[PDB]
Design a protein around this ligand. Structure first.
Ligand SMILES: *C(=O)CCCCCCCCCCCCC
Ligand SMILES: *C(=O)CCCCCCCCCCCCC
Lengths: 604, 41, 604, 604, 41, 72
C-alpha cells in the first residue's frame, strides 16, 4: 500500500464515496510503506551516530527514534477512495501531516548541528588520508595524534572534544580501531557503523570497485534511454525537440566559407565593383562589394537568430587607402532584385538597410599593434527574423564597411568585415535548417555521410548537421564511457559492426567465382577501428568518404548493440584491466605507507 | 587528549588504539540518501 | 531497524546503558533490513544465473544463497545504545562482520569469474543485435547459428560451450526463445530471468520509454536542487562558493578589448611615445608604449591569477623596422605615479619590472611563413598576487617588447605583444571580480542585463559575469533537457514567462483609455521565443537590450517554474512526439529485419 | 527471495533437481519481492491520482489496483533450481508473465492518457509559480482564477474541466488548499498526495535542500569510483582504456609549435632552400621548404589518425610573388634519407608523395578581404596509418604549396601552409603517444610536472598529456562540485594537502639548528591556494614549476582525501553558506509575493 | 468555473479556497520512479 | 546545571536578540498614563521595517508567545 489512509464517512461499510481521507487536526495520516522507513531510518541513523557529540555540547535532545513520529492506525490506504479500497491495512504505521513536519524539521535542525561538527571532524580526518585501496598500512597512533595536535588550526572542534569526536569518528573510519578496554589491544576487524556499505566500496582486487563499475553503467543506461540515443540514425522525420537542442550558439568566420560548403551563405561573384549608395543618418555612404567575391550571409535559410558579427583584431588598412578610414563599419542587409550570383551592377540591388552601424568612423575603432592597425574589439549585431524577410526572394546580410566616399585607393580593397568572427545564435529552437531550407523535423539517416569534410565544420548553429552531431556526441560518450572501445577486447560495440561487415562483404561475394572466402581476423580488426574511429571523433560519421562508419547499416547497428550491451554489463565490468589497475593501487598504498612512516618518526 | 572517562566508551589517548587503514573497508557514512520525489514516494 | 545489534550486557532489564554492541569472535552482527537484502539478493541473483557455466568449467562451488552469510540472532538493533533501545527485534536476520567479509569477497571473486565469460557471451550476442524497439522480427535459428559459427574469433568462449553459454544467454536475451522439449516448438512468450525489468525497458509505443523519460527527469531534478539553479537571479550577496566555480580558466586577446568593455584593462592613451628604460639582466632595454593606445592589463581588479600571455603565430615585423629585432619580448609590470589615462611622459612611470622575459632576441623566436615572419609559439607568464600590489594605486601588466635600442624605424610600430592570446587562470576561487572590484560575494540580479554585447565576451575568468553565466548555463541544460522548450507545446518554462508578461503588460495598461485589451495569442508566442532564446544562448540574459528576458521578473520566474515543472513530469513525459519517435523505431526494426533476412540467406 | 518461482516437478521431495520453473498457460510466475512492489505501486499511485479526470473524460476504466495483476502461489523461488531451493516461500505474491505484460501496457496506456492532461494542468499551474522557498505568500483565489481565465490559451484542458483538473491539482500542489465544505475556510496544512516527498524537498532553512545536497554528493561519489579518479597519479603502467578517452580530436596551428615543445613535430632547419620536384598528376611541381625552418608534422610518433589540415582565412600573397599563384596547395608526405634536422639539400629527400592536393591553383582558392587575399576555407586531409610508415626511419607530413615553377620572387616566401588550423583526430584509441613514442599504457605520475608551460597546450590529441589532463579534469569537477574548495572553510581537499606540506617541511627541518618551527597558519593558507589552484585549472599540475601541486605527494594525496571526503558528506552539506543562501531565498519570495499582489489587483 | 457538484469533492470556484504557497511543502508528484534493470530487478 | 544554563543561555541569547530589535523597535514602554496603537497597523507595519534576517518574521506567533511574557 501507499498514500494517505482512508476510513469511510457515513459509517458502517465503506463504499466508494463512503470513504474520505481521515483528516485529523494534526493532519492526514499518510502510510509509511516498508522502503520509505528505510530512508527516514537511514537519515536518523546517520544522526544518532553523532550521539557523543550532542551530549558533550549540551545541544541535541536524546537519540531520535523514528517511532516517535509515527502511529499505529488502521484502515484502507490508497491514493483515492476507489483504489484505497483494495489495501485494507491493519495497524499499519502511518505518520500524520503535522508529524511529517517534525520528522522533517528535526532531521533538518539536527542535520545542521551535525553538518557543522561533521565538518571539523573531517578537516582533521582526511587530514591524514585514512583511506588506502590495496593491502593495509598502519601509522603508530601516538605519533599520529601528537602530530594532528599540531597541524589542526586553533578553531577546529577536534581539539576541544578529542575523544568526543574520536567516538563519533570510530564509527565512520574503519581505519581508526579503538583499543579494547579489557585486553588493551586493537581488534583486527574494524566495526564502523557503516559496516556493509564500507565493505562494498573497498576497491575489490578482483574487479575495480562494485560501487564504481555499477554506476558507470546505470549512468550510461540513463543517457541511452534519455536523450534518445536509440534511434540515432532513424530514417524518418523527427521533431527537432526530439534532439533537445540547448545552449547552442556556434560562431564562425564567413567571407571564407565557400558558398557550396554551406547553403546559408551566397556570394556576389561579379566582374567589376558594385558601388551602391544609401542615406544612413543623413550622411550618404557607399556600400562597396569590392574586387573579390564578398561572401554574404544569405537571409533565407537563416532560422530567425541573433547574428552578432564581431570585428576585432582583424586588420584595418586605413593607413594605405585613406578611403577606408572615415567609414563607419556596419552590418547591413541587401535586398537584390535578380538573385545574387546573377546580380551584376548597382541597378540590380533593390535597397540596402543599415541594420546596425558602428558609431564613429574607421580611425577611432583602430589601434596600432605594430604598423598594421587592428580593430578595437566591437560587436555589430542584427536580430534577423524569419518573416521580416517574407516574400522578398533575395536578401543578404553583409557586414561591410559603408564608405563615406569611394575612391581609386579602395579599388582593390573590398571592405567586407566578414573576415571577423561572426556568432549566430538560433533564437527559436523549434525550427532547424537543412541544406538551405528551414524545417521542423530532421531525417537523421539523411545527414549521415552526406556532408563533406567542411560541409560539417561550416554547419549553421542548430541545423540538422549540428543537431545530428550533438546527438552522436552523446552516444559517443556512452560508448567511450561504459563500453571498452579502447582496448583489444573486441567489445560489444566493435562487435555489432563486425557482424554488419560480414553480412555485407558476404553477399557482395555471392554470384561470381567467390574466390575470396570472407576474412574475419581482418574484419574484426577493420570494424574495431571503425567503432573506435567513431568514439574518437563522433562527427566523422557525417562526412562522405569515411570507411565503414558511413554505410547505412552501422550506427543504426552500433547504437542498438551498445544499447543491449549496457543493459547487461553485470556489476564487475571493472574486471577489465583490473590487474594493472590493482597493481597501480598497491603502488599508491606503498607510497602512502611511506608517508605514515614519516608522520611516525618526525612527530614521535 | 586529556583523559575524559565515561562520556564516550573510548578514550582517544586510550591504551592500545591504532590508526591502520585497510584497503578492505573504505570508511563511509551515509551521503547518498535518496529523497527525490518519485523515489521517496 | 538498522545498524549493529546490541544486547543487555547487564542482563534482563535493557535500559539506555545496560546495552552494548553484541560483538564477539565473528565481529559485530549488523542488522540486514528488508531493502538491504534486495541488493545482496539482486547481486547473487545475477551470479546464480551463470550456473550452467560454473559447472561446465569446474570453477564456482554451487549456487550462492544469501542465507549462508546471515544468522537469526535477536536483541535491540540501533546505531547507539540510546536509540537501539527502541528497536527490539526478535530473530531478525543479521550478518556478522567476518561474514559481511565473505558475502563481499565471494560476490567479488564470482563477479570476476562471470565478468569474464559474460564478456564472451556478449561479443557474440550483441554481434547480431538481439534488440529491436518496434514490433517483432525473427531470423531462422539455423542460419543465425551457422553464421556466428563463422564470425566469432577463435578465442571467444561461446565456441567452447555453445549450449553452456546458450543456457546462460536464454536468461538474458528474451530474443532467444529455446525450443520446448515435449512439443519441439518455441513459446511465444520469452521467459528471461529479468522478466519484469526487461518488460519495463521496452520502448512502449504510448510513451517513449519509462526507464528513459523517468531518469531524464530525476536527472534534471538532481541539478535543479544541486548546483542551486533555484535562486538563480536572487537579489542579494552570495558567496562565490555558492557557484561552485571549477576548471575555470578563460583566455582572450587584449590590445583589442576596449577599456570600457572590461574594467580589468586600462590603456595609455597619450599623444606621443613614452620610451622608458630599465636595466634588465645588465643590458638596458626600452619599453615603448608606441603610437597607438597600448591597452594594458590593469593589476588592481585582477584576482591573484596565473596570467600566461601566449605570443604565437602573431606577426613579428623585424623585417621592416630592424629596431624590433634584437629585442627580447617580455611580459612586464609598469607602476605609474599619476593614474594611467593621465600618464603623459616617461617621468610619470614610477618603475618597470620585467616579470618574465623571453631569452633570445626577436630573430630566433621568428619563423618565416610566407614573407610575414611569425612568432614561434612561446608562453611568457607572470603569477600576479592580490597583495604583491598592496598600496600601489597604479600598476599595469603589459606584454610588450623591451627594445635594446629605440630608433626612428620603431616610431609607428608600438611593440605591444598583447595581440597574442593571453590566458588568465584565477588561482584562488574564493575571490571573484565585478565591474573592476574584487569581492567575495555576487548579487546575481545585478549582473542581469547589465553587461553589454561584449562586456560579457570580455569577462575576466571567474568574475561575477563569468559566474552568473556558468550558473545560467546549468539551468539552461535542465530546461533544454527535461522541459520541451523546443516545440509548439507552450511548456511550463515559456508558460511561467507568459504569466509575467501578462501581469506586466496589464498594469502598464491600467490608468489611461486602456484602448488595448491584452493580446495573449501574441503574448504566448512572444514569451515562447523568450524562454526559447534563453535555452538557446543562456548568456544573453546578461546583455542590456534583450526583449523580455532582461526584465527583473523573468528567470527568477522561469527557474521557479521549470523547478516545479520537473517535480511533476509524471514518468510518461516521453509522450511528447512519441508518435514520430515511434514511427522512427518501426522504421529501424523494418531495416533490421532486412538484415536478419540476409543472415538468413547467405548462411543457410 | 527473487526470480521466477519453481516447484517440485517430481513431487513432494524438493531437491536441487526435482524442481522446475513452474511455467504454464500464463507464462512463468516471477516473484514480486517487497521493494519491487514499491515501484509498481508508486507508478500506479501516480496514475490513480488522476482519477477525477478519467471519469470526467469517460477514458480510463476504474482505479488500477496492483493486486489485479498478481497472484498468491507458493513454492521455491530462486534464479536456478540449485539456489531456488533455499527460498521456500508460502503464498508469496507472484506476477505471471502474461500479467507482467498488462501491468506494463496498462501503466503504459494510462501513462499516455495522463501524460497529456498532466501537461495541460501544468501550463496552467506553473503559469503562476506555485512554488516559493522561504516563508509563505498568498494570492487571493478569486483574482488568481479570474486571471488564468484569461491567459490560458483556448486549447488547454483546464478550461474544459476547472474543478476536474482542480481535484487532480490539489494533490500535486500543496499551494492550492481547497476550502473545506463544512466550515467554508482553508486548512493551514496542505494535504497533497505527495505528503512526505513534498515535505522533504522544501528548501529547509537549516541546510539548503536535503534532496539537493544529497544528490550533489552521490553524484560526485559516482564519478570518483567510476572514471577512476582514484589512482589519478598512480606510478605504474596503465592501459589507455583505463582513461576512457572518447570524443577526443584536438586541433592546432603548427609551423609555430617549436620542435622541442612537442616531439611529434620536427623542422627542416637548413641554410638555403631545398627545392625538390615530383610528378603529380602529370604536371611537375616543386615542393619548397623555403627560407625559414618549416616545421613539419613528424610521421613517426603520430598515432594513426585523421590529420585534417585546414587552410582558411590565412594569408595567400599571390599578389607579390606571382610564383605563389598557380600552385595547388597540398598536404604532402616527405621521406628523407638522413634524419631531418640533418637534411641539407634536395639529394637528401628520398621521395615526396602528394597525399592530398587541392584541385585548382592558388588564384581561385583566394578571396580578397581588403588587399590581403585570404584562403577560401578548404580542408586538405590525409589518413596517416601507423604501419604505412613501417621501416621508413624518416618521413614527415608537410602541408606545403607545390609550386608549378619556382622563381626568384619565392626566394623568401616559404610556402608552408601549416600556419593553418590543423586538426588531428586519433582514429584508434587503444594506442596513445608519449614524449614522441607510441604506447599502450601511461604512467600517470610520470606526466605530472614534466611538461612545460606549452609542452601541454601543444599536446597531441589523445596522448598521455591529453589523457592525464582529461582525467584530472574529472577529479577537478568532483572537488569543484562536492567539496567546498572555494571558501575559507579549510575543506577536506585543501586539508589533505596541508598534512603533506607539514610532513614535508617538517623533515626538511630535521638535522641542522631547526631554527624554524613549522608555521601552519601559513601552511594552511599555502595549501588552500594549492588545492584551489588545482580545482581552478586542473592542467597546471602537469607543468614543471608549479608551487606545491607538482610535488609527488599531492594529488595522489588530494584525490584519496576528496575520496573519503565525499563518502561522508552526511546529507546536510548544504549547511555551507546556508545563511546567505537562505536570506537570498527570502529575497525572492518577497519579490514573488509582490507579483501575486498585482495578480490580486489588476484582475480583481 | 461553472459549478459541477459531485464529480470531484471540491468545487473550483467553491467557497473559501485559497492559493497560498508555503516554502515548507514544495509541490511534487512522482517523476523519478526507478526502473533501471539492476534497480527494478 | 552550569553548562546547561550556559548552552541554553546562548540559544535564547540569540533569539532574544531578534525579538528585541523588533520589540524595542516600537517603544513598548511609556511611564505616565497609558497609550494604545491598534494592533493591525502595528503588525502590518513591523511586517515592513524588520530586516529580512531577523527571526520574528520566520516565527511571528512563536516569538509573540515568548514576547507576551516579557512585554506587558
Ligand atoms: C587532546 O585533545 C590532544 C589532541 C589529540 C586529538 C585532537 C584531534 C586530532 C585527532 C582526531 C581524533 C578524532 C578523529 C580525527
Ligand atoms: C471555469 O472553468 C472558469 C476558469 C477557472 C479555472 C480554469 C483553469 C484555470 C485555473 C486552474 C485550476 C486548476 C489547477 C490550475
Amino acid at each position: 500500500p501507499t498514500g494517505k489512509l482512508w476510513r469511510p464517512v457515513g459509517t458502517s461499510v465503506a463504499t466508494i464515496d463512503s470513504l474520505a481521507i481521515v483528516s485529523d487536526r494534526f493532519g492526514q495520516y499518510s502510510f509509511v510503506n516498508e522502503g520509505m522507513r528505510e530512508t527516514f531510518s537511514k537519515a536518523l541513523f546517520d544522526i544518532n551516530m553523532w550521539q557523543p557529540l550532542f551530549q558533550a555540547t549540551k545541544t541535541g535532545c536524546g537519540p531520535i527514534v523514528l517511532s516517535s513520529f509515527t502511529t499505529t492506525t488502521s484502515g484502507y490506504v490508497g491514493a483515492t477512495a476507489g483504489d484505497a479500497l483494495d489495501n485494507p491495512v491493519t495497524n499499519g504505521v502511518f505518520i500524520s501531516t503535522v508529524q511529517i513536519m517534525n520528522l522533517q524539521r528535526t532531521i533538518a535542525a539536527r542535520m545542521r548541528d551535525v553538518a557543522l561538527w561533521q565538518k571539523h571532524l573531517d578537516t582533521a580526518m582526511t587530514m591524514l588520508t585514512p583511506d588506502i585501496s590495496a593491502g593495509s598500512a598502519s601509522c603508530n597512533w601516538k605519533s599520529l595524534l601528537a602530530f594532528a595536535k599540531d597541524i589542526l588550526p586553533l578553531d577546529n572542534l577536534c581539539l576541544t572534544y578529542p575523544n568526543e569526536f574520536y567516538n563519533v569518528a570510530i564509527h565512520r573510519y574503519p581505519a581508526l580501531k579503538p583499543g579494547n578496554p579489557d585486553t588493551k589491544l586493537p581488534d583486527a576487524q574494524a566495526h564502523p557503523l557503516g559496516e556493509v556499505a564500507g565493505a562494498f566500496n573497498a576497491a575489490t582486487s578482483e574487479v575495480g570497485s562494485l560501487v564504481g563499475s555499477s554506476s558507470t553503467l546505470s549512468q550510461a543506461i540513463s543517457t541511452m534511454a534519455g536523450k534518445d540515443l536509440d534511434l540515432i540514425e532513424a530514417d524518418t522525420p523527427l521533431p527537432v525537440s526530439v534532439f533537445t537542442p540547448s545552449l547552442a550558439p556556434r560562431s564562425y568566420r564567413p567571407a571564407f566559407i565557400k558558398p557550396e560548403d554551406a547553403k546559408w551563405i551566397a556570394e556576389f561573384n561579379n566582374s567589376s565593383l558594385i558601388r551602391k549608395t544609401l542615406t544612413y543618418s543623413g550622411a550618404t555612404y557607399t556600400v562597396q562589394l569590392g574586387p573579390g567575391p564578398t561572401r554574404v550571409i544569405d537571409m533565407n535559410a537563416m532560422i530567425d537568430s541573433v547574428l552578432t558579427l564581431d570585428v576585432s583584431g582583424t586588420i584595418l588598412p586605413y593607413d594605405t587607402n585613406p578611403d577606408l578610414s572615415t567609414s563607419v563599419p556596419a552590418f547591413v542587409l541587401i535586398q537584390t532584385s535578380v538573385p545574387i550570383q546573377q546580380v551584376t551592377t548597382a541597378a540590380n540591388i533593390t535597397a540596402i538597410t543599415v541594420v546596425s552601424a558602428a558609431g564613429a568612423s574607421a580611425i577611432n575603432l583602430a589601434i596600432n599593434v605594430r604598423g598594421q592597425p587592428r580593430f578595437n574589439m566591437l560587436h555589430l549585431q542584427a536580430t534577423f527574423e524569419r518573416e521580416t524577410i517574407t516574400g522578398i526572394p533575395y536578401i543578404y546580410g553583409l557586414g561591410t564597411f559603408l564608405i563615406p566616399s569611394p575612391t581609386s585607393s579602395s579599388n582593390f580593397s573590398n571592405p567586407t568585415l566578414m573576415d571577423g568572427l561572426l556568432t549566430v545564435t538560433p533564437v527559436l529552437l523549434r525550427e532547424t535548417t537543412y541544406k538551405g531550407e528551414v524545417v521542423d523535423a530532421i531525417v537523421p539517416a539523411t545527414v549521415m555521410a552526406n556532408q563533406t569534410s567542411e560541409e560539417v565544420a561550416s554547419a549553421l548553429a542548430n541545423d540538422a548537421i549540428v543537431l545530428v552531431s550533438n546527438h552522436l556526441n552523446k552516444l559517443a560518450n556512452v560508448v567511450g564511457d561504459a563500453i571498452p572501445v579502447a582496448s583489444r577486447t573486441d567489445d560489444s560495440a566493435t562487435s555489432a559492426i563486425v557482424s554488419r561487415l560480414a553480412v555485407q562483404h558476404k553477399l557482395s561475394q555471392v554470384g561470381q567465382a567467390s574466390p575470396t572466402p570472407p576474412d574475419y581476423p581482418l574484419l574484426w580488426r577493420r570494424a574495431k577501428r571503425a567503432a573506435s574511429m567513431f568514439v574518437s571523433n563522433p562527427s566523422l560519421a557525417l562526412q562522405v568518404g569515411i570507411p565503414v562508419l558511413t554505410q547505412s547499416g552501422m550506427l543504426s547497428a552500433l547504437t542498438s548493440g551498445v544499447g543491449t550491451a549496457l543493459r547487461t554489463g553485470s556489476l564487475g565490468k571493472g574486471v577489465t584491466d583490473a590487474s594493472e589497475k590493482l597493481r597501480a593501487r598497491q603502488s599508491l598504498t606503498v607510497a602512502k605507507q611511506a608517508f605514515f612512516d614519516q608522520i611516525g618518526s618526525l612527530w614521535p | 587528549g586529556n583523559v575524559q572517562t565515561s562520556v564516550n566508551t573510548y578514550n582517544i589517548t586510550g591504551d592500545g588504539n591504532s590508526f591502520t587503514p585497510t584497503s578492505d573497508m573504505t570508511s563511509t557514512a551515509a551521503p547518498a540518501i535518496d529523497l527525490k520525489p518519485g523515489v521517496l514516494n
